[PDB]
């Protein structure tokens, strides 16, 4: 605990300089998420305050690309939900509570400009999908069908590439990998049902072959998702 507190203090001191904070922001994209997880797990007021200060320094306006860094942190590490949970929780330290409130306000301001489309784009870029609310939201798919097919179906091509990578990674058949594969299959089925023009692009890019390969997967959920995608493709 003492070593972790000293490391957090050193990180905050380094991040006090905007140039060093900006350099360390790109050094580890998951550093903010790890710091937030450590702050949530740790009950020490000093450690939580140091973690909050370190997180705020990375997203501070002094550091370069402060808005971009804050948006990326909120999209990847779920900074807004963690900050909202911390605000609801009661902290004995007044300085730690003030830092948590400031971080929550910054996260809310960053998320106000952002939308579900930005979160979906970040998830696609990170190649991580765990059945997000947008995947199960019919309205989101209906209002984002044109965006998916935009730029010569760039989003559809990215989804097809992610599905192909998951099929290549399907040998491991990990739980997270299986969930990602199922989410990708659901997204492909939605993009085939709506905007049918994307079906030809998916077939050209080997999406049908990937679905057929996933139909023989050992996992029951993956097989069911592949069967549903095949039914949406040419089936009833």
């Amino acid at each position: 605990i003492q070593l972790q507190y000293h490391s957090l203090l050193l990180i905050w001191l380094l991040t006090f300089n905007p140039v060093f904070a900006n350099e360390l922001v790109q050094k580890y994209l998951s550093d903010f998420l790890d710091l937030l997880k450590l702050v949530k797990i740790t009950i020490k007021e000093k450690v939580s305050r140091l973690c909050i200060s370190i997180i705020l320094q990375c997203c501070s306006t002094r550091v370069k690309q402060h808005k971009k860094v804050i948006k990326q942190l909120l999209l990847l590490g779920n900074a807004l939900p963690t900050v909202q949970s911390l605000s609801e929780r009661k902290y004995s330290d007044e300085e730690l509570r003030q830092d948590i409130s400031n971080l929550k306000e910054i996260l809310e301001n960053e998320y106000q400009e952002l939308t579900s489309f930005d979160e979906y784009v970040a998830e696609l870029d990170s190649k991580l999908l765990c059945w997000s609310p947008p995947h199960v939201d019919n309205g989101f798919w209906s209002d984002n069908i044109d965006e998916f097919k935009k730029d010569n179906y760039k989003i559809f091509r990215q989804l097809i590439e992610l599905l192909q990578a998951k099929v290549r990674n399907g040998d491991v058949n990990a739980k997270q990998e299986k969930i990602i594969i199922q989410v990708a299959l659901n997204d492909i089925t939605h993009v085939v049902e709506l905007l049918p023009e994307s079906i030809d692009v998916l077939d050209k890019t080997g999406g049908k072959a990937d679905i057929m390969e996933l139909l023989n997967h050992s996992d029951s959920r993956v097989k069911y998702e592949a069967l549903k995608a095949t039914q949406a493709i040419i089936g009833y």
Partner: protein
């Protein structure tokens, strides 16, 4: 599988309906073409 076979029949049934609709369009085109020729007859007359 049984589910695939059931889905195949439904899609095949829709194919017959599409062919019937396409065949009906061909019949309508012939009727419309005759009307165009009939309309041209008045102009030619």
């Amino acid at each position: 599988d049984e589910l695939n076979k059931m889905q195949a029949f439904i899609r095949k049934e829709a194919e017959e309906k599409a062919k019937e609709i396409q065949l009906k369009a061909d019949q309508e085109y012939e009727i419309e073409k005759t009307n165009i020729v009939r309309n041209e007859t008045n102009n030619i007359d």
